[PDB]
A paper describes a structure:
In Gram-positive bacteria, nitrogen homeostasis is controlled by an operon encoding [name] (GS), a dodecameric machine that assimilates ammonium into glutamine, and the [name] repressor. [name] detects nitrogen excess indirectly by binding glutamine-feedback-inhibited-GS (FBI-GS), which activates its transcription-repression function. GS generates glutamine from glutamate, ATP, and ammonium by a mechanism that involves the initial phosphorylation of the γ-carboxyl group of glutamate by ATP and the subsequent incorporation of ammonium. The structures show FBI-GS binds the [name] C-terminal domain within its active-site cavity, juxtaposing two [name] monomers to form a DNA-binding-competent [name] dimer.
Residue numbers in the entry:
A (entry chain J), B (entry chain B), C (entry chain A): 4 to 58, 67 to 82, 87 to 370, 385 to 444
């Protein structure tokens, strides 16, 4: 898309307002709404926001991200954050991912695809409009109505996403009660992260329209399956998958093996980025279909890395520890950098486990492991690395001092 | 606009009623509604009201302020208050600002632009229609729905303002929960103050339609960021900005430096006018993004005066201590006179603070400082000066004797 | 009293427990209860407490303060606070008053009497036992039952105080509804301050037995008379009043005039100590029988200093600005030092006002005036002076940022 294309779209679609939206370090999408009479100012990269209020900057819209919300008509553009000197801000996760991809392109790889699959819960709202603790239904995996009561809301979400240009693959009820999954096809790295960001807000808006609250919190309830955001990744060097070997019986190139070796070797280091909440490690517990051991397998369900049986152009590596609360840009950049480190150091792959280190058990331990990894620092840059560590340390210190109801139930009558 | 233009508008738009509205000393907009059959009497400056009931007078409409409320169709005219002898009333803030501008024009300056940016809170209404203490949402800076629940109300306010001829620039959620900001571009001094007055009433009218209460109180809640009304001001002598120097690397003329020197030197004096409430000084406290130190900077966030990095015709000076509860005419006249004092006395500018007196801490201290400044007395004239001081002194005396709940919580059990 | 007297009292009265009680800088009485089996340890000045938890110390009981609470039987001793080296702690208000009296004795004055008269309100308790905002009755000055419903509680307080060795003089309903006053005769400075401390706790304990809450808060409610703790002061040099002149028609010595001159001259300085609360200056407002002007009179009701018409050995000077929330030791020491300053500088007295500086209007202004006065610093010593200033500054900073209900009632709908 060019400026002329955007102008033509604005005139012919009668777009009245523009939403310039971007993402902070915590993965929260931030936006400012602007009347279409400021279209020329927006297209000249002259829009300005504060920056000090977000975890003197400029907004540079990415014109390929133009899309109209089908709910005054509003269109949106996903913008990169630049400084006053015309250079991209080093603390912007999206510009970070772009430059990581640019560094990848020097190794001969021309593309990096991401197929995500986030899961979410639906909770009922009260009369005041606040979410309650009761799920929308008590359905199970692949359940249908009236056992699956989220069928109408899920259908409306799919309908709204299709109007916005998504390529939806499947939709179904998930294992936990009130848990749902909508699948969309892979895209390029940047547009896949944009798809995740847009998908979360579309899901939340349409769920609110249905008197429901949608949350991507990893483990909202104890004793119930958590939500994951498995990352399917594949490398390409020119209209061809770099992971697929049409000669060996297994069908994986040496590049695919080195990528897996690098991801496995650096998995402990990027866990904090891929699992950024304190709640994220209540999901990484045994017995709930969540990965907590660093291993890979081609024929098995719950190692850290699973290589699906499909081959050809669909040959991919699935990292299963990513949760929907993670920042897609930072997590994808960390995974890509770990894989590229494995590629360029020619690491040998441990034997697949078909029947072994451990992921960090808490956010504090993951932060400790993140400070000791050199690959994650290079993946994130100095600014994002330092801000993430400082904010997560403050968050953990806030969490560390709380007294929970579990403690008052076990103690206070026994002691 | 002429009389013929107004008559043509009344016939062709089928206007049924006229709202002749003006502003008192406290910034409250007052009006009387008149059937369109009295249009000739209105245009002949023969409208009369009491005057003794407002903090034997004639209304003189300003025909350029014609606008129709898009919600019997009603149009409005902003009127000046005249005495029975045909001379403007010395206690009318709008006529005061007009004559201050007339005095400024004798110095060679032909224009004075004001770009304001007021902020407001939205509170939920109860069943009886009274505002509660519960904010409309719990969103943050640049937040979006469903975290930003004021999106629809803000969009309707913007839509309603655009029909009235405003040029809206941006709208977004503000830092505090339930705090919102809608930005409109600068205009001439008188019409900018008229824009502020119209903006407040449009916001308050559209909020009621959404079962919400809009308030421009500076600090409605403790522990929460307050609302400001930063004043962006620039001087012109004929289709060219007098603050812009395209020779120096900094890009500011000597005139811009003397204006800043005058505003800084007289900043203590006009604080009471720019912060006229007792609540205004609960916002002027450290740690909440509010100015409390009399200093200027070009590259910094929170001095009293901020000079934005933009240059050319958009070279401005931002006075950041003005709150939305201030009377726009009186505050703008005070700031203009303070700047012109430095212009005509060639005051030298203190060095910018990039890493120092203090603003008055209470309304009583601000009133004490106002009685000791000659520039504010010359800016407001004798009548407005005396009435403002008397009314604010009475208000402070009423506030001083109250016993708050904080006092009964700290004491009453300890003593 | 000697150690043998205390042992005899403990054996013959069958005292089971001892309360070693002392006063912190804020006037709050602190105590620890000890079984009578530790009587020898208590009498050997070997009792220890923390000190860091109170606004490694030793307790030295003052044996003359022995008294038994008539409500296991408990007696108490008022203790001085000493350091580990056997010297009195410089931050103890009682030891401060003792050394100020010792310094006074070098001037030839052998005694210093104080007649206090604190006033208190009575508030009804709810079912949970918390105080409410409704007064016990709606009686007035010198009112009787059933208009005065505090008659029984006041009688029980008087009965309990008489068993404890008080010499009660009068008890009556006060001007404000629910306000009461019980008078006891003067004593020496240290024992008068001990009487005030004991009186407050006895009143608060007995009121609780009547399902009432007793408070010595200066101004608990707006629009209603506040509570004062007038200090009646007289100097003696040997079984004779130094203020009484049997030859002059008025009957006041030059010493009495110089004492008044000193107190008037230093009145602004010690106001913060005598009025230590933020609420204290809601009482110091015109129209409620409270002093706010620094002047003296012999025949008038409301100057700052009143000299009662009685002469002989009962010739006294009444300072009327002290409220019952003040620390009696610190306020008495400040007043004594202020008077002695005039005594030793031979200050001339301003003419009595029978029909003029102004007391500080807020706690902040009183603290500012405290830092500029050397007599108060000499009276309190360095440690108490600095601790009081720091704590009151923090308290004022906490109060300054609150948003009261008055502000939300005046504003929030007007703006």
């Amino acid at each position: 898309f060019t400026k002329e294309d955007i102008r033509k779209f604005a005139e012919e679609e009668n777009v009245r307002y523009l939403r310039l939206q971007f993402t902070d370090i915590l993965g929260t999408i931030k936006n400012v709404e602007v009347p279409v009479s400021q279209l020329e100012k927006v297209l000249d990269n002259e829009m300005m926001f504060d920056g000090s209020s977000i975890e003197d900057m400029y907004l540079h819209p990415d014109l390929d991200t133009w899309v109209i919300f089908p709910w005054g008509k509003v269109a949106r553009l996903i913008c990169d954050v630049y400084k006053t000197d015309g250079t991209p801000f080093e603390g912007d996760p999206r510009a970070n991912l772009k430059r990581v991809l640019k560094e990848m392109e020097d190794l001969g790889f021309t593309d990096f695809n991401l197929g995500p699959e986030p899961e979410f819960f639906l909770f009922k709202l009260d009369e005041k409009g606040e979410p309650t603790l009761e799920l929308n239904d008590d359905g199970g995996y692949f359940d249908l109505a009236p056992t699956d009561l989220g069928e109408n809301c899920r259908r409306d979400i799919v309908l709204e996403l299709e109007d916005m240009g998504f390529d939806i693959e499947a939709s179904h009820h998930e294992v936990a009660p009130g848990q749902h999954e909508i699948d969309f096809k892979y895209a390029d790295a940047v547009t896949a992260c944009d798809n995740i960001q847009t998908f979360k807000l579309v899901v939340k808006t349409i769920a609110r329209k249905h008197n429901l609250h949608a949350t991507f919190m990893p483990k909202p309830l104890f004793g119930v399956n958590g939500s994951g955001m498995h990352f399917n990744v594949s490398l390409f060097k020119g209209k061809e998958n770099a992971f697929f070997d049409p000669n060996t019986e297994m069908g994986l190139t040496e590049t695919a093996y080195q990528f897996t070796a690098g991801v496995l070797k650096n998995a402990r280091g990027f866990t904090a980025v891929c699992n950024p909440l304190v709640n994220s490690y209540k999901r990484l517990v045994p017995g709930y279909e969540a990965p907590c051991y660093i291993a890979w397998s081609g024929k098995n369900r719950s190692p850290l890395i699973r290589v699906p049986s499909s081959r050809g152009l669909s040959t991919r590596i699935e990292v299963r520890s990513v949760d929907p609360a993670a920042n897609p840009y930072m997590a994808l950049a960390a995974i890509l950098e770990a894989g590229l480190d494995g590629i360029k150091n020619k690491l040998k792959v441990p034997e697949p486990v078909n029947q072994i280190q451990d992921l960090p058990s808490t956010l504090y331990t993951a932060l400790k492991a993140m400070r000791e990894n050199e690959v994650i620092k290079k993946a994130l840059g100095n600014h994002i690395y330092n801000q993430f560590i400082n904010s997560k340390s403050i968050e953990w210190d806030y969490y560390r001092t709380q007294v929970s109801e579990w403690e008052r139930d076990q103690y206070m009558k026994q002691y």
